[PDB]
């Protein structure tokens, strides 16, 4: 019962903020620019400093034009309204939203320990125990965001930072969508894709327990499980049924991974009747102690080295780009909800 009570209230506190969102509340000159932390094909992200509080944040800017002409409108309006209706340890906090002529901005509490990726490719693969406490997260984050209609689909280390408490904060919630039963847009990381994404299927929540089998095996090998020079040759061993292990592995964490990794929807451990409880009981996880984990009791397998909030030496050089904003305004139909 502690548990449907939970979620009953983070359901009912996330429709609340879901039904009226907030809007416009700050603006780029309050803010100043520090350094580009991150770039794709339709924005980047900075570190900035609000200039009257000194707090750093990091601010996600996208450009209308290229939203609109990669067909990602719908999606970063869900972005947008999602993260600002929900509320748990391990989901970056939204603070601010707002838009102008040229760009759509969120700002986002900066974690600076940098990406799980990076660490993970530094000391090569995660032991048992460390992959487990990042898994974890996962595990209670996927229960609570199912619970409420969300489904995420874009895990994967490079968009799991890690904070000042050696801890995960979920960021990029560009692919995350309110889904009551099935939805069908082909999104997400060729190597995290569930069989069914790949074969053009009305899919659900299952494909973010798919995935997270692949977050499990690529933390505690190394690598992920389906790998290849072309998206093709990637997706045929996916869609194939069979999975390679290394010997180091345990037995249970085999036993974990054939059960998430498992092709057929219908079968796939956080799909079935029990739900979440099949993971949160499997033996791999005997020795979690999941409230206190999600009060934050646990010690960290490492902190992440860093000086200061506006350290940003856990992340990486990118060429510094003008934040140019038109004189006319762009695209404001599309984002009149923004
Ligand atoms: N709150 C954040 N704090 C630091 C960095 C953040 C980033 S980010 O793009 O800079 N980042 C690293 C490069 C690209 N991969 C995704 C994660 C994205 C979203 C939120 C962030």
Redesign the pocket.
Known sequence: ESVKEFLAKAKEEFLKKWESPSQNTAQLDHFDRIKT??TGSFGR?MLVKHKETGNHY?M?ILDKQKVVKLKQIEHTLNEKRILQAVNFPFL?KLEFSFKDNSNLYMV????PGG?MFSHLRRIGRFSEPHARFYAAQIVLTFEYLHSLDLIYRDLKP??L?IDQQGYI?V??FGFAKRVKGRTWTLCGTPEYLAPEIILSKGYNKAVDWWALGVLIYEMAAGYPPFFADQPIQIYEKIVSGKVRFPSHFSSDLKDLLRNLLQVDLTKRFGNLKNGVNDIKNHKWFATTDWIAIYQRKVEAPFIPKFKGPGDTSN?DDYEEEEIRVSINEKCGKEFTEF
Do not use: C, H, S
């Open positions: 932390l991150g992200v990091a996600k970056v986002m509490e900066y974690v990406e490079e968009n930072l904060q960021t990029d992340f």
